[PDB]
Amino acid sequence: LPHKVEFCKSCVISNQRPFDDEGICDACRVAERKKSTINWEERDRQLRELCDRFRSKDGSYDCVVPGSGGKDSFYAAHILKYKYGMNPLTVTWAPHMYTPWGWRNFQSWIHAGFDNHLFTPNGRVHRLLTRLAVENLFHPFQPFMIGQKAYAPKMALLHKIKLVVYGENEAEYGNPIGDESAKRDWKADDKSKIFLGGTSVQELKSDFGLNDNDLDAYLPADPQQIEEQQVEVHYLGYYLKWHPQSCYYYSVEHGGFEASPERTPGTYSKYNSIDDKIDDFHYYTTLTKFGIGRATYDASQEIRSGDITREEGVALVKRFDQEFPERFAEEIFKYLSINLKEFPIASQMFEQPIMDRAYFMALADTFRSPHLWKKDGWKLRHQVTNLE
Amino acid sequence: LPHKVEFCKSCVISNQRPFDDEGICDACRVAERKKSTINWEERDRQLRELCDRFRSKDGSYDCVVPGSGGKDSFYAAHILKYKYGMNPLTVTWAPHMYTPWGWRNFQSWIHAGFDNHLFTPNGRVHRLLTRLAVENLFHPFQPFMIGQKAYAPKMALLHKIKLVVYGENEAEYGNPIGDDDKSKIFLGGTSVQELKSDFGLNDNDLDAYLPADPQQIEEQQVEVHYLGYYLKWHPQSCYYYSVEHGGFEASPERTPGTYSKYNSIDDKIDDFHYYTTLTKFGIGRATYDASQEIRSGDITREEGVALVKRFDQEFPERFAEEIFKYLSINLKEFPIASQMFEQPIMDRAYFMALADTFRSPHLWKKDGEQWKLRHQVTNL
Ligand SMILES: [Zn+2]
Ligand SMILES: [Zn+2]
């Protein structure tokens, strides 16, 4: 039985996303606590000492910066190279489907002065795992994120680079390192012990025509090798005050970063996560499953940053959160389609291998919980509201 | 003093490209020798036990297939995986500038069932080295080719893969295998010493162009094989195969300087590459395409001659302006290197003037304001 929907009284987020005694999410408390307790000058000195520790004296890379060429990864790599005198190799786990602006931003990243190693996993395997994750979990990104989180550490192992810097805030407030990942390497020995897109590796090979090579790209970094090679993952948001709007204007100035030419569906923003077309369906699934769409996440980030008030947040959520993303829907349906030509085995496992709109909407219904949705000739039972 | 231009009597190529006693290029004789002496069934058997030797059982990659997702690299990876039961990692040294169809073909490659590791070198460094190679050698691809040739062996070392298979004919006919003072080493006609000294580069900027460590190659038993040794390589076959199995997309329009639509269509700078070879050697893209098709038996020397006469001297206008911008070394992106150039921002007039400085009078004669070739290939 699911929890009754309550909204946080600082941001516009709900308790459904996968609160304290004043009804405030941990996220608002961490942001507000950081906006008093953090001395950014002494964090700047810690960054300069970390760079001194790792900076390469020869012509080798001293730094791995993962990212898609979005405003955050652009800021991270650009400030590490041209302000802290680092030599980052940039590395990209490929999106499902490049947006035009997303591809231009990836190129602008490279053309700001960076080598880039882009890994694009087997497109057939990726589509099958994405379709399975949509069918089983209504979570297209589930397999993708397993590969993404593994990629940068594995790339540091391959190029024998020790330092990995993510252009985002730390996972644990106060700690610039993350290290938990070892539990991913164990998850194994058995058939139905490991899972991918809500399907066991055993049944992927058994029934969907996959082999162990098709899954090599998704395996986590070997923790023995990580420890052995002294690979350290750092979060640049620990060391530098991370402000998305600042990263946008910085990336426009120094890189020619291009915002989405039109408003991102489901939200009001134009420069948050704009490289992957399937991003649209990701926020539709979370909306369907948890009653909170993309405008909720964007407005919550902007309320904590101090760029908007909770009242403007509530107005934006009300206007945009329930918008369906039509622009790429048809390409995405084709991407999710498991045809006989490309998938001689896997295609037969699906009742409707070729996805259309009606099938996707029917599938969405099966993830729409009646404690969040009531029909109107659908509508949220509970929308975020302004404070009393 | 340069050699007087003679054309080969089998194909339509000249002796200027960087002949025997019947006036036949070595390339025509080697194609003739191959279409007689080669038992392709026995070459197929040799391929099957190259594959047996290297095939991986533990679900790791057992081979590296380099390429851009053009018809050849598509064929190589697709036939190795789906016919010879290999598990290739595909590997791409990025082009200067993706064509739209080129990028869609690279994606079609990945979506035919291949993991791909794409290396895109520092775009500023690449533009500066390409502009230098254009100024000094009239050879935009020179630094690109150094990096490209190094890439696949280095990738085999990184992923700890032993077998590298190029989707092309062998370099040496008959064998399928390939075998401190900064003012000594050169890149785009410029020494490493002067690149760092005067153009604002460091050792890291040039790391991507360094060759594979030969000690590491020998130690890890990395073998480069050429698939054209083992399989009868026919460009047009690779095209129709790649269309059938991958949705390979030809150029929507005829490639400038030639008649073809699916030979090397991924890099916009490919246009200027064939213009420079024409300017320096009197032979453009139609000469290379027609010569290949004459040896394959698909056209006669006379059709070749007609195609060279109509297409070889075409200037590639479609991407000219984007390429001039690509070669432009502005102050924002190159605060140091920009000042080294008399005209940092390239335009058409500067490119044409620079071309003139490479147009040798033993190959080109003026006719009013139109350059014409002193010697064009003839039917004979
Ligand atoms: Zn909150
Ligand atoms: Zn010849």
Numbering used by the authors:
A (entry chain B): 37 to 54, 73 to 233, 235 to 242, 246 to 435, 438 to 448
B (entry chain A): 37 to 54, 73 to 233, 247 to 447
What does the paper say about this structure?
The NASAT family belongs to the AANH_like (Adenine nucleotide alpha hydrolases-like) superfamily, whose domain forms an alpha/beta/alpha fold for Adenosine nucleotide binding. Members of the NASAT family carry a conserved PP-loop (SGGXDS, where X represents any residue), indicating that they may have ATP PPase activity.
Here, we report the crystal structure of an N-acetyl sugar amidotransferase from Legionella pneumophila (LpNASAT) at 2.33 Å resolution. LpNASAT folds into a compact basin-shaped architecture with an unusually wide and open putative substrate-binding pocket and a conserved zinc ion-binding tetracysteine motif. To confirm the identity of the metal, we conducted inductively coupled plasma mass spectroscopy (ICP-MS) experiments on highly purified LpNASAT, and the results showed that zinc appears to be the candidate among the transition metals under investigation. PISA (Proteins, Interfaces, Structures and Assemblies) program analysis of protein the interfaces suggests that the dimer is likely to be stable in solution with a favorable interaction energy (ΔiG −3.9 kcal/mol), consistent with the results of size exclusion chromatography. According to the electron density map, a fragment consisting of approximately fifteen residues (residues 55–69) is severely disordered. At the bottom of the putative substrate-binding pocket, LpNASAT harbors a highly conserved PP-loop motif (122-SGGKDS-127) on a region between β1 and α3.
